[PDB]
Scaffold this active site. Structure first.
Site, mmCIF file in Angstrom:
data_model
loop_
_atom_site.group_PDB
_atom_site.id
_atom_site.type_symbol
_atom_site.label_atom_id
_atom_site.label_comp_id
_atom_site.label_asym_id
_atom_site.label_seq_id
_atom_site.Cartn_x
_atom_site.Cartn_y
_atom_site.Cartn_z
ATOM 1 N N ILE A 46 29.920 -20.154 -29.042
ATOM 2 C CA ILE A 46 29.793 -19.927 -27.607
ATOM 3 C C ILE A 46 31.031 -19.187 -27.143
ATOM 4 O O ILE A 46 32.163 -19.585 -27.451
ATOM 5 C CB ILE A 46 29.577 -21.233 -26.829
ATOM 6 C CG1 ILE A 46 28.367 -22.001 -27.370
ATOM 7 C CG2 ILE A 46 29.389 -20.885 -25.350
ATOM 8 C CD1 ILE A 46 27.079 -21.191 -27.443
ATOM 9 N N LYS A 47 30.822 -18.114 -26.390
ATOM 10 C CA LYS A 47 31.899 -17.232 -25.958
ATOM 11 C C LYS A 47 32.276 -17.553 -24.511
ATOM 12 O O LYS A 47 31.429 -17.565 -23.604
ATOM 13 C CB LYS A 47 31.459 -15.793 -26.167
ATOM 14 C CG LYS A 47 32.445 -14.729 -25.871
ATOM 15 C CD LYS A 47 31.972 -13.460 -26.577
ATOM 16 C CE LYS A 47 32.713 -12.262 -26.088
ATOM 17 N NZ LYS A 47 32.381 -11.050 -26.880
#
Length: 352
Positions: free
Chosen positions: A138-139
């Site tokens: 997840i960015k």
């Protein structure tokens, strides 16, 4: 030639593709990349805006989703999560082959959450579960709230790509938050060996901001000098006794990931950033035109640690000139958030 990607692996750097689309995966192209030396994939809202607008394979998916009672954001997320799942499946053999160290695909949370730590944690946990793959990251933008969220997400066992870093100080704050989350897990008797975090430190945007007003001996030098100094900071932080005590127990170091490595100024060679930033335990995510330039006429040499003295001297002159790279970093992060939000609103409009 193509073998350069393997040569860079032997120097300790992974090359990732800074692009994702439904056709990249469906066509078989990504799988063939994952067998030529590409080692992962990154996305962001601008990448999805372009993919959704240009890739014919979205048309039927949008038409299907418009027959359901869904918000534009949910329509986008259904599309994007599907692409990420599919890419993760393509990358899974690579990921498993290294004990979970490579073969990641990154999906960014909504830009509007960037200054909301709790909302970021909630969305990141949700998207992690929705993708349902061990090789998804997840960015999360490296705002202060993002670093708060990083600690929580690491303590939850979630792999994270912390993005929009332009600051050595903010990057060090991220390492400390990571270490706090790892220490939490170890204290609770929980696993840490599969948690992977990258720190996406942006390159071209620094030179784009400064070059027109710099003296000649510094044009096109600042971004590389910052990156080289950041890597020196990384070596110092992760070899210190404090982190070594965690690594002894199975913790992975964070790795620096060079982003925004497409050259934007035609006065510089198109492989400048890739060629200049190769070092051990790093990643470089490249757009497809830069990947092809590097294959064609890039050079695989361990350049990242060369001439660190010069990098320091250059940063000293940047400060002498009155450029505060910490003020610059904050401005570039905020402007990157604005640009990502613009791109996101632009991709949502056709999904109404």
């Amino acid at each position: 030639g193509m073998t350069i990607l393997s040569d860079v692996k032997a120097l300790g750097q992974q090359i990732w593709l800074d692009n994702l689309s439904r056709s990249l995966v469906q066509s078989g192209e990504l799988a063939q990349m994952l067998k030529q030396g590409v080692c992962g994939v990154t996305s962001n809202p601008a990448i999805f805006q372009k993919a959704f607008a240009g890739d014919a394979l979205y048309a039927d998916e949008v038409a299907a989703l418009k027959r359901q009672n869904l918000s534009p954001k949910q329509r986008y997320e259904t599309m994007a999560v599907a692409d990420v799942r599919a890419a993760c499946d393509v990358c899974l053999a690579e990921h498993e082959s290294t004990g979970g160290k490579t073969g990641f695909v990154s999906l960014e949370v909504s830009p509007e959450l960037a200054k909301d730590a709790q909302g970021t944690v909630e969305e990141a946990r949700r998207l992690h579960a929705a993708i349902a793959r061990k090789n998804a990251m997840i960015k999360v933008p490296a705002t202060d709230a993002g670093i708060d969220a990083l600690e929580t997400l690491v303590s939850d066992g979630i792999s994270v790509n912390l993005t929009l870093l332009f600051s050595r100080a903010q990057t060090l704050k991220a390492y400390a938050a990571y270490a706090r989350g790892i220490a939490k897990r170890l204290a609770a008797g929980q696993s840490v060996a599969h948690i992977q975090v990258v720190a996406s430190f942006f390159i071209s945007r620094v030179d784009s901001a400064l070059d027109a007003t710099l003296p000649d001996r510094l044009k096109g030098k600042t971004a590389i000098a910052l990156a080289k100094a950041a890597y020196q900071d990384w070596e110092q932080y992760f070899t210190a006794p404090e982190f070594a005590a965690l690594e002894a127990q199975g913790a992975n170091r964070v790795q620096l990931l060079w982003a925004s490595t497409g050259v934007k100024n035609p006065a510089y060679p198109d492989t400048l950033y890739v060629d200049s930033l190769i070092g051990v335990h790093t990643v470089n995510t490249v757009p497809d035109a830069t990947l092809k330039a590097f294959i064609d006429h890039g050079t695989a040499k361990a350049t990242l640690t060369e001439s660190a003295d010069e990098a320091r001297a250059r940063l000293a002159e940047i400060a002498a000139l009155g450029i505060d790279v910490e003020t610059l970093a904050a401005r570039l992060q905020e402007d990157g958030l604005k640009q990502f939000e613009e791109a996101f609103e632009k991709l949502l409009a056709p999904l109404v």
